[PDB]
Design a binder for this molecule. Sequence first.
Ligand SMILES: CC1(C)CN(C(N)=O)c2ccccc2N1Cc1ccccc1
Ligand SMILES: CC1(C)CN(C(N)=O)c2ccccc2N1Cc1ccccc1
Ligand SMILES: [Zn+2]
Ligand SMILES: [Zn+2]
Ligand SMILES: [Zn+2]
Lengths: 572, 562, 388
Amino acid sequence: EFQRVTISGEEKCGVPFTDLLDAAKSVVRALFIREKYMALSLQSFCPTTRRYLQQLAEKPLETRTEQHPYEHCEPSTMPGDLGLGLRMVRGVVHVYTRREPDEHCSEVELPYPDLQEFVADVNVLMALIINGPIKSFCYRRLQYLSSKFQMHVLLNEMKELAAQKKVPHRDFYNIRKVDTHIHASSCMNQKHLLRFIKRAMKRHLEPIGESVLREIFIKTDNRVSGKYFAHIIKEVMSDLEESKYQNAELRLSIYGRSRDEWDKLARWAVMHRVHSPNVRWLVQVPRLFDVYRTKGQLANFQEMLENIFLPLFEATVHPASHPELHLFLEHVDGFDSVDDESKPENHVFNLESPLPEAWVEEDNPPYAYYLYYTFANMAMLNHLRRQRGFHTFVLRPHCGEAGPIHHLVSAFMLAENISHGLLLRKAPVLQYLYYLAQIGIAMSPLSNNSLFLSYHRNPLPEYLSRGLMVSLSTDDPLQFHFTKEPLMEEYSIATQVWKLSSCDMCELARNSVLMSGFSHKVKSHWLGPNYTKEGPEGNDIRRTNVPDIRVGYRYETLCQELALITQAVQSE
Amino acid sequence: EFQRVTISGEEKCGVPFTDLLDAAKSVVRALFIREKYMALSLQSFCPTTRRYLQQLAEKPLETRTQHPYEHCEPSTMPGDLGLGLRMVRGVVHVYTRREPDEHCSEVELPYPDLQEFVADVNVLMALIINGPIKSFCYRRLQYLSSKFQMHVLLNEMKELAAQKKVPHRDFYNIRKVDTHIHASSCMNQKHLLRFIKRGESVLREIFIKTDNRVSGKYFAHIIKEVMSDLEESKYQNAELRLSIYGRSRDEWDKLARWAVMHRVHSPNVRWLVQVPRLFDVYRTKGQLANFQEMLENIFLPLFEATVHPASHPELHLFLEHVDGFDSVDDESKPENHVFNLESPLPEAWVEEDNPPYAYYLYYTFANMAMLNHLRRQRGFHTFVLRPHCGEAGPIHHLVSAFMLAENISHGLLLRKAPVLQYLYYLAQIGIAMSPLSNNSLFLSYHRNPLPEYLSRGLMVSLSTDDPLQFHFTKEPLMEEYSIATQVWKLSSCDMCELARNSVLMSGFSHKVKSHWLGPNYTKEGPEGNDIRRTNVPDIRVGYRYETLCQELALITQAVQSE
Amino acid sequence: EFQRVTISGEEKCGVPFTDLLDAAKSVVRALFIREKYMALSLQSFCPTTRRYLQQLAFVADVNVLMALIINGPIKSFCYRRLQYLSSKFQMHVLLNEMKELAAQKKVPHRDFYNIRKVDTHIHASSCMNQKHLLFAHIIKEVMSDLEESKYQNAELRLSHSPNVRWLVQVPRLHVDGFDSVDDESKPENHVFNPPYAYYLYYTFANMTFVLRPHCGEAGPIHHLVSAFMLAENISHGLLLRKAPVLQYLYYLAQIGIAMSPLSNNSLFLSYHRNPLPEYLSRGLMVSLSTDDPLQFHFTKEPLMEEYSIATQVWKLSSCDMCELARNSVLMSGFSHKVKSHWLGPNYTKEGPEGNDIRRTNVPDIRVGYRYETLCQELALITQAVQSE
Ligand SMILES: CC1(C)CN(C(N)=O)c2ccccc2N1Cc1ccccc1
Ligand SMILES: CC1(C)CN(C(N)=O)c2ccccc2N1Cc1ccccc1
Ligand SMILES: [Zn+2]
Ligand SMILES: [Zn+2]
Ligand SMILES: [Zn+2]
């Protein structure tokens, strides 16, 4: 056991009940909104939050959802055509019983999202983030969480390190560590890339921006590009494989400028044999519609929404139509949004906004606009893929690095995990929810120092202390890092600058695996057979190096805070 | 050229001329004190500082200007001159002969005088306590900070453009030296813990109480592995610290054989020897009778090898890669005794107390100075004194180094000693800082004064105190740069300037340094910098040289005006 | 004479000429976009800025300025020159502080108590004790107390004492002007309750009266864009720190900012992070004010307490305080006759000629650096445009 800080008294929250209830009711409703949209997308919701939410809920809610894998490219073995019709209506993609005019087509009763409902939930949340009385309560409870952590370490730090001293075999250098936010394109040496680019131009005759790279993937066979990018990632795969305990979640780019992009990418993975047991792919949709339309490359935003989400629906129905994409999507776990979040937004995503088929102006759709139609199409794709026993997907957007705070309202509803999250520090309401919902925030403090928020100002220490599921990642593994082990270098600067214990380090590593897209089987090996179990019963120091004392503190603190909110709503 | 920040009027010092004159006279006096003990020690003194000093002096200044361990044949080594050696009042005296001769005359080496040293110490000890001078020094240190801010705000882009006109050089293609790394810290705790096959104290005894056959073969591989890891890097070199404790006279001969047997030699590794200041522990066990025994076990083998190469065969070879001495111990430990003429001498120090830091440093300096004089005449390689100074404890520890030390490590207490920092700048004394290690133990990372020392123009360099500890990666010098480059948000000029400082603060040969930084690296100012090898634009070197010369001139002109 | 920091070489602005003029064009334009609006509204424009602007001789202008504040490459020129102003002041104080203090002592007749000060942002409703509440009586003693203080004056707001002058206020949800007073943290969802940019547009040109608004406290950063076009002096100003371009224009236009560091700590900022010291160092016209004379203040000399807390926290010198006091009178809504006595007959002269240390306690060295610094900066912005 450990010294337990018990707040005995009447105003155990520190506010009058008349003020606890107002914030509690709004918080419960906000948590319900996330639960609804996570179920619709077959995405995850915090079991501890649900177990407490099932007491005020009027509707039941629960969790109901070797050979080189790419070597065997036999469309014959794959599941066959279902003859389903794929058409996009008002942004979302609808699935139909028949694929041809020859036979009658009936819409498959999938839970197609309602935009009016979304524009109502958003407006409820967007009013909770500006309520002074509630924003004050959340700030106070956030400050209490940090104080509770400080007393815990003061009164139990040595008990933790004694447990770590026992079980000597496990140390931060042999615990599982997942890089939860690394861009694959940034794994290239700018100097070496220009060398390859320079020679290739002469090959066609026989610094380099991300825009020049996009066009090559969209306007080239990728025969030369797919080899240079294959060796580099494969070397990263091999280097990450020698370091048995370091794994990466690389980000690949699907731009939505053509419908052959998904097929072009699955060939590169299969042709060049780009698979690792440690590398898991998440696909990023660069929010560059403004540039495409102004070039006359896309007529509607719906064309982009189609060129991204239709090649996925087609392979879920007739795997042999896209043989490679069927095998490449078993190692793809979700989608991501990428762009300069600093850029201003002149348009609000409401019911009075153009639909993807009507958005023909050169303006760029708002951030919520990209996020809602990624969530809707993904949710239907997951519902369809689950029935066929395929791979469910998740939405993990770049949310919070800069720009408006309202971006975090969009991700609170539609996103399982976020990246960065630097602007939650300015939103007491949102941070309280992100904690009570145990939403994963994969932070890259080093990249933030050189572009946005200084390392001194970075809120990672405060999120980690208060209980938010934070993890450390290398945004660009070669630009903001000088070592050849960038993930470790990230754990070093943060460990030293904020002076973090081994328990603090290992907690981040554990948080790096619980928010990753890895199999239950590999996670069972990584974190133990009972990693799914919530609380101390899911922690094995022999595999995590994290004392059950800390896991008890986090679990107990979250349970107590949830109880405060729920019990208040039960006493009105 | 670059934007030049210039001052107009008469009160360019910002204070009354009386304050400048009072400070300048004492500053010049302090600078002469260092110049004296550097020349006596055959060590280095800043050329630009000396040039200004010569114009205020009535005498000329004394400072001016395959595998090695493969075959050990004493018959090829230099001859024995038959000189006799004895330690008198701490220092070792060389005599015309050891056997009955016409006259065993003392060899006229410039033996130190303790009374002069104590007088010089007490002058500085009062200078670092004078409020008027402290205020003047504090303002000028602030001025150096503001001047640097103007330079970057006005010439950062000019500098960055120059670094781009030579793309062949970047931070990874420039030579860098780890100027303060301890060799014993290059070993894995777990691997060495199980190496017993069943902490510094145990390791000390495994070098003194045993042949060091299993120990040397094991410690040799772990260090020779680091040698190849650096040779592959090509551009990363280290100055590793080995321990000669002084408990036996066989230590020096032991260490040389370990290097010549296991061939622990690399072109990127230069050896420095650290004498841990643990006399009290040794005396309380009965292993040393008087402190003079410790000074004898450290310097007599070196003197004997200098006179009689064949007497110590491996040492004559191991000493061409040993560059100097170091002093190591918890500098937080309180000091009860002052080093005055009323203090016991090495031969009289029979008590169990630990001699003060200056006591250790003065006798290390004195014996080293005579050794360098003798080795210089023999043509052998001279040594240097590079103590651990300033990490913690009293500020007076930095007065000792200002007089007797060519370089210092750490140096974190200059932040509370305005006069000393001003003197270290005008004297351009190396300060091998390890911000990462400092964060864990003593001073927080953001409060480490490395940004201020570097901005104001002190010869600062970055190093890894413990390579395998405090560093999570396997390129610990680079990780040290990364945290410093990012936490303090530094530029390429800042990074590449620290790299050049690391090399100009090392003991590497002129030949290798010429290959690294250019044939004319010996020249002072911009003329000694080629951007094709350093990646530091001549804009930055020009600002540094101009600022130093101008600051030296302000001090010099004030004294001349009287 | 005083020691002077002289830059010599090429990129004395710190950027190549291409980036200098790319931002001098837009800065020169925005400065014109204010003179005309000050010319029509009967408001005041800076003499020195107008002198250089002459040699270069609504929603549309708003869009131009709104584009400029976001122009990133331009926002890097302003920041570099803003920091140069902070650095030049640090060198100036280091090499001239000793003489400036001696000059301030050379005329013992004037001290921080003998100089004239103006509370440029106090609220009349806040002069009354709420316990006492549970009108003219309170203001009568405030006027009497100010009258008892020979060298202390103020400007109150209503939603004749010679030391008190009125500036009416109008919530956005003898007399000399108007102010728009409302919680500026209230988010704006419509682009022009009537948005902030709305009230100022109609309050702008009605004028004589001058529009001195409550702008920059919090909320949108664009409020300062409206004030840079439709304001003479502003209160708070805590958001110019977030906008490098606006501050570079507020400095070059010598716009008056009435700051209340004591009150900002209670709600909208922290005393450590308050940008008052940085503004004063760079040369922006900053004055010290008490938003509430009794809520935040514990003494019976609140403006003195306001000046004291700033002086001690940021370690300000005698020149700093006296420089702030003169800035209070100069931006005050009083007459040439009033300032012929409080500041002197030559207070209209810009720069050293307009300074009488026997009446301001500010040495000519500080006035020389302030004026010289501004003239060179405008010359850089203007002479670059002239030779395009
Ligand atoms: C855009 C990117 C860089 C990365 N990428 C995806 N899908 O993001 C990709 C995938 C397969 C082939 C090429 C690429 N390229 C194009 C390219 C690669 C190598 C050299 C030049 C250009
Ligand atoms: C003290 C040290 C660690 C390092 N050292 C010097 N001179 O500093 C040394 C040199 C030659 C042989 C042994 C050592 N050892 C002893 C040792 C080596 C290997 C394993 C255990 C103990
Ligand atoms: Zn990213
Ligand atoms: Zn050390
Ligand atoms: Zn007000």
